[PDB]
């Protein structure tokens, strides 16, 4: 019966484990644990790709169940397009970019 | 693949040298042991 004495993560988790824990509480994903969800990927509704620098590598699985991923660097600026399927991607500095 | 011209070009003469030295580092010590084998068999 009764008796605690075991600390919880809320009380004792620290460093990155603590950051991931707090960020998930506010439904945020700054350490890229989850797959992001595609938009329609048109010029008007591009996939927004957060980054803390001015470029990030994108992998495009053009069609569900392709075995081949298309890799290319996405730079800050106008949306760029997967050279295979043309879906649009745009780098958003920040969210991350602290 | 494309490449920059050599920063430190290795001229044909320099190749001859690197090649000759490479071959001798392999050949001489083995050749020396093989040459003296019959010496080693029964001393």
């Amino acid at each position: 019966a009764s008796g605690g004495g075991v600390p919880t993560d809320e009380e004792q988790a620290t460093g990155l484990e603590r950051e991931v824990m707090l960020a998930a509480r506010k439904g945020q994903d700054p350490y890229n644990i989850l797959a992001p969800k595609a938009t329609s990927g048109t010029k008007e509704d591009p996939n927004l790709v957060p980054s803390i620098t001015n470029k990030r590598i994108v992998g495009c699985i053009c069609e569900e169940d392709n075995s081949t991923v298309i890799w290319f660097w996405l730079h800050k600026g106008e949306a760029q397009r997967c050279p295979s399927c043309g879906t649009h991607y745009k780098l958003v500095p920040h969210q991350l970019a602290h | 693949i494309t490449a920059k011209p050599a920063k430190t070009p290795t001229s044909p003469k320099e190749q001859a040298i690197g090649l000759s030295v490479t071959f001798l580092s392999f050949l001489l010590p083995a050749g020396w042991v093989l040459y003296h084998l019959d010496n080693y068999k029964k001393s």
Binding site: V58, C60, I61, S67, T68 | T2, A3, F23
Partner: protein, 514 residues
């Protein structure tokens, strides 16, 4: 700096680099050993004057080429360099454990060299069967040293295998399924699984051999109710997966090279290729007694092992055809790596087909412990595994170093090597059909012509080795730095430049779900 970086590394690239240096050095040792074998056999008569020493040289040739050259280069070398880069992982799952896998190898190797220096060496064959390997026919420390060398090489590959499987499973972008990984990554994962299961069984068998030799156990000694055949089962239960472990990552690299120089975006039949390597891994656990067809097993067991072994041709056939299918319609670039690959495809097939001959326990009665076996396995190893190692090395060398090789020299190197390994091993078919035993330091005069020719061919491959060292010096000496690499959209490992920075994917890649 130097010590922190190179002795205390937690970086997958540096450690892959250390594997490559180690395996290159071991390869020279194993090459010298292979030349001492051919010198002994190159004319009738006795050259060394001591068949214990010829036995030691043959046994050490095998351990060296397998545990210290092939595995460290393919799994430790290319595996650590390319796996994290192919799935966008910032390093291996266990970066400090990774470093101990590497550091186990120099001392393991030292123990192997020690064994051939104390007493009269371990003249046992790489199979180290008792009673020959036991404490009467091989009294003293040499065989114990060999056993401990195998222990440490086993602990190394087991921890490495756990690291690879963990990394490949857990450290991919969350959107990427296993059916989106490149074939090289698959080939490593599969290999790591075969390592994980097979090496503990070897470690068990050779521990029993150790206790027979020093603790008065009688696992293998009929005077105690023990049975030398039990050793062979344990050994080969590891040994057959071991041979698949030696070729799988080779398969992996072949698929990457042939695709690349064909200018294709992916191999033909990706899912057939994954299925083939899986099927090969599975069947590789249930065929081992085809190394035991003359020990006196019952006929039904031999019928079963013959039948199960043949079946392996089917999935392997699917890979060979799928590589041809990849070439089909290609924009073929005749790079030197492409040349190694093409040579690989044809010479591996020939080595594979002589294995199908050996698979018949019927015919194996007559071919077992002959040079036909030796021809079979140097085809798939020295023109399968080695060719894949050379093709991957010339293909990825600019990515590891940031420098280019001289292509023309590299083609000269392939040409000489192609002639030397065929001249060496081709006539050994005749030797084994006509009845020449393996592990002989001299032979009946009838067998002289093929042996003389085989030994001349081994000197030609020596010249190719010497050249290769000069070719690598030339690259470093001239410093042509890489500018641009084609097809980076389907070859992620090149996308961080050459050489890539010490930390890559500090920010991981972005891949949408959809």
């Amino acid at each position: 700096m130097f010590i922190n970086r190179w002795l205390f590394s937690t970086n997958h690239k540096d450690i892959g680099t250390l594997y490559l240096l180690f395996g290159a050095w071991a390869g020279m040792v194993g090459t010298a050993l292979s030349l001492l074998i051919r010198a002994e056999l190159g004319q009738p008569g006795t050259l060394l004057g001591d068949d214990q020493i010829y036995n030691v040289v043959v046994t050490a040739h095998a351990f060296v080429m397998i545990f210290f050259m092939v595995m460290p280069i393919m799994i430790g070398g290319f595996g650590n360099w390319l796996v994290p880069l192919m799935i966008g992982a910032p390093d291996m799952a266990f970066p400090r454990m990774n470093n101990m896998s590497f550091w186990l190898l120099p001392p393991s190797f030292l123990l192997l060299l020690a064994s051939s220096m104390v007493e009269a060496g371990a003249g046992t064959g790489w199979t180290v069967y008792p009673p020959l390997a036991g404490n009467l026919a091989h009294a003293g420390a040499s065989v114990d040293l060999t056993i401990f060398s195998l222990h440490l090489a086993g602990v190394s590959s087991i921890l490495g295998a756990i690291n690879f499987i963990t990394t490949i499973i857990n450290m991919k972008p969350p959107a990427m399924s296993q059916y989106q990984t490149p074939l090289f990554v698959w080939s490593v994962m599969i290999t790591a699984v075969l390592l994980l299961l097979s090496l503990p069984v070897l470690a068990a068998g050779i521990t029993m051999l150790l206790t027979d030799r020093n603790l008065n156990t009688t696992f293998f000694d009929p005077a105690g109710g023990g049975d030398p055949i039990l050793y062979q089962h344990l050994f080969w239960f590891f040994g057959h997966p071991e041979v698949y472990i030696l070729i799988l990552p080779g398969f992996g690299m072949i698929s990457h090279i042939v695709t690349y120089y064909s200018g294709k975006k992916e191999p033909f039949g990706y899912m057939g290729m994954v299925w083939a390597m899986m099927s090969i891994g599975f069947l590789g656990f249930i065929v081992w007694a085809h190394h035991m067809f003359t020990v006196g097993m019952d006929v039904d067991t031999r019928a079963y092992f013959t039948s199960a072994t043949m079946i392996i041709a089917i999935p392997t056939g699917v890979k060979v055809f799928s590589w041809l299918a990849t070439l089909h319609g290609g924009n073929i670039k005749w790079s030197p790596a492409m040349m190694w690959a093409l040579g690989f495809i044809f010479l591996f097939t020939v080595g594979g087909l002589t294995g199908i001959v050996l698979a018949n326990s019927s015919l194996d009665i007559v071919l077992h412990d002959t040079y036909y076996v030796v021809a079979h396995f140097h085809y798939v190893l020295s023109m399968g595994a080695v060719f894949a190692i050379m093709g991957g090395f010339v293909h990825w060398f600019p990515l590891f170093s940031g420098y280019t090789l001289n292509d023309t020299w590299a083609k000269i190197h392939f040409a000489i090597m192609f002639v030397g390994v065929n001249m060496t091993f081709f006539p050994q078919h005749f030797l084994g059909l006509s009845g020449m035993p393996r592990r002989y330091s001299d032979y009946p005069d009838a067998y002289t012509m093929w042996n003389t020719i085989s030994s001349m061919g081994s000197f030609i491959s020596l010249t190719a080795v010497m050249l290769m060292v000069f070719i690598i010096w030339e690259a470093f000496a001239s410093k042509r730095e890489v500018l641009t690499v084609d097809l980076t959209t389907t070859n992620l490992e090149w996308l961080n430049g050459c050489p890539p920075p010490y930390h890559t994917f500090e920010e991981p890649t972005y891949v949408n779900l959809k």
